[PDB]
Structure 1
Amino acid sequence: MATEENVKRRTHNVLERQRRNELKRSFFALRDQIPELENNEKAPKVVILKKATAYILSVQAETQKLISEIDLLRKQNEQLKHKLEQLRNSCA
Structure 2
Amino acid sequence: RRDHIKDSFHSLRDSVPSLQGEKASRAQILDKATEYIQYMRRKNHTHQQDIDDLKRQNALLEQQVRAL
State the distance in 2 between where 1:63 and 1:42 align. Answer: 28
Runs of 4+ with deviation above 2 angstroms: none
Structure 2 unaligned segments of length 5 or more: list them: none
Secondary structure of the structure 1 residue equivalent to 2:24: coil
Report the TM-score when normalising by structure 2: 0.95
- Alignment identity in percent? 40
Name the CA distance, whole Å, in 2 between partners of 1:77 and 1:51.
Answer: 38
Q: Which has the higher contact order (CA 8 A, sep 6+)?
A: 2
1:1-92 correspondence runs (5 A): 19-38=1-20, 40-87=21-68
TM-score by length of 1: 0.71
How far 1:26 sits from its partner (Å)? 0.4
Report the Cα distance in structure 1 between the residues aligned to 2:61 and 2:28, rounded to whole angstroms.
Answer: 49
Unaligned runs of 5+ in 1: 1-18, 88-92
Q: Once the two structures are superposed, what CA deviation does each residue of 1:37-83 show, in whole Å capped at 9, x if it has no partner?
A: 00x42210000001101100100000000001000000000000011
In 2, distance between residues paired with 1:86 and 1:71? 24
Count of aligned positions: 68
CA RMSD of aligned residues (A): 0.8
The structure that has the greater radius of gyration is 1
